[PDB]
RNA sequence: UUGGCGGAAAGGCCUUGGGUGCUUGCUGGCGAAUUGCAAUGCGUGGGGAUAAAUCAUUUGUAUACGACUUAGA
């Protein structure tokens, strides 16, 4: 914060990479039934509830039906049913 | 547990009878969580008894040396 650099490491250039919201595939819609391909609950059927700002999908089993609680999941490890 | 069957490398096929579990065929309840967003998720090396082999002896229907051929608790 206030310590002067004791070794003049070169500063990084102005990176021209602005963050953009994830463009999820149209097949992913809220309320869709999802199949988990990996992780603790791999192979379980899950319901798509909400999209999170961290590029993850807020999902629920529901917990009562199959024991899968509210957890974050990646869209790339999920198959969206009709 | 009963009966038959499979010889090509059968060694497998059913099957009468009962025993004990599941049944998602149908109706419901209990728990999943925090692993936190994926890192696939089987015989020795030393002893106790002993079935058998080789050597010793002998044998000669065998013989350059191995090998082969007999018999004595």
Swiss-Prot record:
It comes from the Eukaryota. It is found in: Cytoplasm. N-terminally acetylated by acetyltransferase NatA. The modification Phosphoserine is found at residue 6. Component of the ribosome, a large ribonucleoprotein complex responsible for the synthesis of proteins in the cell. The small ribosomal subunit (SSU) binds messenger RNAs (mRNAs) and translates the encoded message by selecting cognate aminoacyl-transfer RNA (tRNA) molecules. The large subunit (LSU) contains the ribosomal catalytic site termed the peptidyl transferase center (PTC), which catalyzes the formation of peptide bonds, thereby polymerizing the amino acids delivered by tRNAs into a polypeptide chain. Component of the large ribosomal subunit (LSU). Mature yeast ribosomes consist of a small (40S) and a large (60S) subunit. The 40S small subunit contains 1 molecule of ribosomal RNA (18S rRNA) and 33 different proteins (encoded by 57 genes). The large 60S subunit contains 3 rRNA molecules (25S, 5.8S and 5S rRNA) and 46 different proteins (encoded by 81 genes). Present with 37100 molecules/cell in log phase SD medium. Belongs to the eukaryotic ribosomal protein eL6 family. This is Large ribosomal subunit protein eL6A. It comes from Saccharomyces cerevisiae (strain ATCC 204508 / S288c). The chain holds residues 7 to 88 of 176 of the full protein.
């Amino acid at each position: 914060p206030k310590w002067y650099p004791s070794e003049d490491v070169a500063a990084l250039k102005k990176t021209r990479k602005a963050a953009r919201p994830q463009k999820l595939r149209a097949s992913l819609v809220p309320g869709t039934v999802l199949i988990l391909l990996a992780g603790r609950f791999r192979g379980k059927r899950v319901v798509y509830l909400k999209h999170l700002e961290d590029n993850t999908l807020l999902i629920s089993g529901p917990f009562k039906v199959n024991g899968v609680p509210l957890r974050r999941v990646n869209a790339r490890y999920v198959i969206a049913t009709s």
